[PDB]
């Protein structure tokens, strides 16, 4: 993994040593080259994973998440440079440096063998994240509202640290390869119930789980576009990636300890989709859309069948590209009207014809139109949870109806109908914006031709 | 809000249009249109406005009972089949500003005439703002009506978006 | 119940401008200034059949004959119906007739 760590670090000298007017050109060009070389990680095997060294490994789960992470850095740079153009030069380089350091922690996080090494990096990603959201965020409101920092660290980060420390004492190691052979069953015990919650609550909050999700809409309304892109696309998948790994050592206690979280996810899947129908803020609508989609991933991970793990991996990648594109589409409107209200500017298809095509494609993938990988992932989770209990088809089906409703409602409200009379500064879509959208959707649709490389290790 | 005189005439028009929806055939409609007209004529010269109001209220109750479930609606009227059919084709004039110079090079006469209008709008705006302020009582307007241009050379205040509104069949 | 004298005057003044504006939407004779019989129907159709039928079937036949049908069970025929009195091409077999029907 040093062939990706070292070039990523070298983006920092490159950014600080570029000519003043070349910082965006230089970093975007070279970060796209790192993204190109990330495709060499797809040297996967049917039986073994790609174990590079004592610290890092890659398997079919982390590999697609790594490629998505490395793809997103150039896209974030393209999306950020317009609104940072009035920023002074030293602050543009610090902003770029935060994004590079965020990628450095993410690629290391997804490949760490040792779960304690994963924990330190899994938390180090918050330092660049909060700095980006707060220092370049919209308002004076605190994303780390204090209550959320306390609840998360007390009920999430700290219990996970103690559980991991406890596990290594008992097992003698937290290397994930070792945990595959030395795993022992978890018997019923009040102490074991608390180990289970400790091992899972941190990832539940980051997913987020329904009932622990109110932080996510607040963060999106405050974050800059790059913040929303990384947060939606990857940072939520850190919780999903963590659960897919740590559930190896939690059986068979997950057989019953998962019921409350499945209930929260199955019900919260419908409650958050319905909320999307009465959202007045695009960024909030997309944020609640992510909660609904990540409810499927939690259910898939907790019932742990081969089909649900394949569906979970596909869902995480598909949502990453789709939710990121939706935030970029909303941001482009915001950069003209300077408001997140969804009802303010209407009938935009009349004024921006091609951008309306990007909107339609983003909405069709969001509502899981076949054969997009959005549906492939969602169908697999639906197929698996039907076996878990046939009644779930009712809740899964109803959510499919509602998801189509708010996806097209968002498309209809903003793109169709009569345009707003007094808004007279809607300039034609820039090449930068059109290319930003097409770099989201083309890879998303091309993956329909070869879905196996996003189906994870269970494939 | 309306006068009594307006409510009756609105009920006469609405009554006729629903009667036309029931009758369908022009001769049958013309027969009952004169029967209906006669009913109004029977009470044209009433003077007791208490009776006149009670006559109107009973008429409107009668209308609601005899109302047609599916009255005919002109295609382009609110609720008709063509209502707002061409809104997707109406592009506001300010969009021409953002045209590329190569796009404007295709219509040199049209765009020359368009700067003449934009010049006229500029030179007129200050005068329009004064005329409204001087003619406007203290406390703001009492109604939405707007005045005409008073002098030769002036343009009626607030005219651009009325004059340059999209055609009703833009494409 | 009609227009007040100012209402008519404002309407008249907006009529002049509105009608002048619409007259100005007409295009000049030069505008837009652009930058720089059986055989015909047969050629249009003949060239269409070639590009949109013959070439596609050449590619499809090549694809099916040499790439699809060379893999098992990719194109599965329903077996032809054999009726009594038939002659099998592969073996030369002769399917016997059916019994003599009773009169009807």
């Amino acid at each position: 993994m040093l062939k990706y760590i070292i070039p990523t670090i070298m983006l920092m000298p490159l950014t600080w040593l570029s000519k003043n007017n070349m910082i965006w050109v230089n970093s975007t060009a070279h970060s796209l080259l790192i993204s190109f070389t990330s495709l060499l990680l797809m040297n996967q095997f049917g039986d073994n994973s790609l174990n590079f060294s004592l610290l890092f490994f890659s398997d079919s789960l982390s590999t697609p998440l790594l490629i998505l992470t490395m793809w997103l850095l150039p896209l974030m740079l393209m999306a950020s440079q317009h609104h940072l153009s009035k920023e002074n030069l030293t602050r543009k380089k610090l902003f770029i440096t935060m994004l590079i350091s965020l990628q450095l922690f993410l690629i290391m996080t997804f490949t760490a063998m040792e779960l304690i090494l994963f924990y330190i990096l899994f938390e180090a990603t918050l330092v660049p994240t909060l700095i980006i959201i707060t220092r370049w965020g919209n308002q004076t409101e605190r994303l780390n509202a204090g209550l959320y920092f306390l609840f998360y660290t007390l009920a999430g980060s700290l219990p996970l640290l103690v559980a991991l420390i406890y596990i290594q004492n008992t097992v003698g190691s937290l290397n994930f390869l070792m945990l595959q052979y030395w795993v022992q069953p978890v018997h019923n015990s009040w102490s074991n119930v608390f180990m289970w919650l400790a091992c899972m609550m941190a990832f539940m909050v980051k997913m987020p789980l329904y009932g622990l999700h109110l932080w996510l809409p607040k963060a999106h309304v405050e974050a800059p576009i790059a913040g929303s892109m990384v947060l939606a696309a990857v940072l939520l998948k850190l919780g999903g990636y963590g659960m897919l790994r740590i559930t190896l050592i939690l059986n068979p206690m997950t057989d019953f300890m998962a019921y409350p979280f499945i209930m929260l996810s199955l019900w919260g899947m419908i409650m958050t989709s319905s909320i999307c129908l009465r959202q007045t803020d695009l960024k909030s609508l997309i944020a609640y859309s992510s909660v609904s989609h990540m409810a499927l991933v939690i259910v898939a991970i907790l019932i742990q069948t081969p089909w649900s793990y394949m569906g979970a991996t596909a869902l995480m990648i598909a949502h990453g590209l789709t939710s990121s594109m939706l935030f970029c589409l909303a941001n482009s409107n915001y950069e003209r009207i300077h408001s997140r209200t969804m009802i303010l500017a209407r009938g935009l298809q009349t004024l921006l014809p091609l951008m309306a095509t990007w909107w339609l494609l983003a909405s069709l993938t969001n509502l899981a139109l076949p054969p997009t990988i959005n549906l492939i992932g969602e169908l697999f989770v639906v197929m698996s949870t039907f076996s878990w209990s046939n009644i779930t088809i009712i809740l899964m089906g109803v959510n499919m109806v509602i998801t189509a409703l708010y996806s097209l409602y968002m498309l209809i409200m903003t793109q169709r109908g009569k345009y707003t009379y007094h808004i007279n500064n809607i300039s034609p879509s820039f090449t930068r914006e059109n290319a930003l959208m097409s770099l989201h959707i083309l890879p998303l649709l091309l993956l329909t031709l070869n879905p196996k490389i996003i189906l994870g290790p269970l494939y | 809000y309306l006068t009594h005189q307006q409510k009756v005439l609105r009920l006469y028009k609405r009554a006729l249009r629903h009667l036309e929806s029931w009758c369908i055939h022009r001769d049958k409609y013309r027969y009952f249109a004169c029967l209906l007209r006669a009913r109004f004529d029977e009470h044209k010269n009433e003077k007791d406005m208490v009776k006149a109001t009670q006559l109107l209220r009973e008429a409107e109750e009668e209308f609601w009972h005899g109302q047609h479930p599916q009255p005919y609606i002109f295609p382009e009227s609110p609720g008709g089949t063509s209502y707002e059919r061409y809104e997707c084709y109406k592009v506001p004039e300010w969009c021409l500003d953002d045209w590329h110079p190569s796009e404007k090079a295709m219509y040199p006469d049209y765009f020359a005439k368009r700067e003449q209008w934009k010049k006229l709008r500029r030179e007129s705006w200050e005068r329009e703002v004064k005329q409204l302020q001087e003619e406007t009582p203290v406390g703001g307007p009492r109604t939405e009506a707007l005045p005409p241009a008073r002098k030769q050379g002036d343009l009626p205040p607030l005219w651009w978006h009325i004059v340059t509104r999209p055609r009703e069949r833009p494409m | 119940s009609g227009y007040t004298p100012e209402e008519k005057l404002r309407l008249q003044q907006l009529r002049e401008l509105r009608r002048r504006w619409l007259k100005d939407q007409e295009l000049s004779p030069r505008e837009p200034v652009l930058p720089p019989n059986v055989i015909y129907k047969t050629y249009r159709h003949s060239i269409f059949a070639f590009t949109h039928v013959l070439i596609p079937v050449w590619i499809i036949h090549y694809y099916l004959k040499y790439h699809v049908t060379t893999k098992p069970y990719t194109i599965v025929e329903k077996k032809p119906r054999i009726f009594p009195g038939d002659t099998i091409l592969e073996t030369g077999e002769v399917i016997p007739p059916m019994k003599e029907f009773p009169d009807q």
Binding site: P428, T431 | E93, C95, D98, E103, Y107, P170 | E26
Partner: peptide, 12 residues
């Protein structure tokens, strides 16, 4: 008579 059709800028 051929009239002008107001459209958004299609060039970009």
């Amino acid at each position: 008579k051929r009239l002008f059709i107001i459209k958004p800028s299609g060039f970009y």
